């Protein structure tokens, strides 16, 4: 029900529901993400990996125990997706709760 990515794919998302708000107004995307969660009427906000959507410290600061839209890194672009599997694997594993 939301996305934060480059405008050519933002309007692509807009093509069939699920309004897209292009990254031409927030490349850091913190401002647009905060505004979208402020309006709050969305079920998820898939944020592109412009720089990084992983540090949700301030996002969960503003939420603080909420059943709000679920942050989810989506992609950066489509040119190669061969090692992204094991990249997400390692990162979700070691940086989240379970050690190593």
């Amino acid at each position: 029900m939301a996305v934060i990515a480059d405008p050519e794919t933002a309007q692509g998302f807009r093509l069939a529901g699920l309004e897209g708000y292009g990254a031409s107004s927030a490349e850091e995307a913190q401002s647009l993400l905060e505004t979208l969660v402020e309006r709050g009427g969305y079920a998820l906000v898939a944020v592109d990996e412009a720089l990084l959507p992983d540090p949700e410290r301030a996002v969960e600061r503003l939420m603080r125990g909420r059943d709000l839209p679920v942050l989810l890194p989506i992609a950066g672009l489509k040119e190669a997706f061969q090692g992204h599997d094991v990249e997400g694997y390692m990162r979700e594993l070691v940086r989240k709760t379970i050690g190593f």
Partner: peptide
């Protein structure tokens, strides 16, 4: 259980790509 779930996550990301 955690290991099975981290197994399924790979297929999910594969279909997403």
């Amino acid at each position: 259980e955690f290991f099975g779930l981290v197994r399924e996550a790979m297929e999910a990301r594969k279909a997403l790509d």
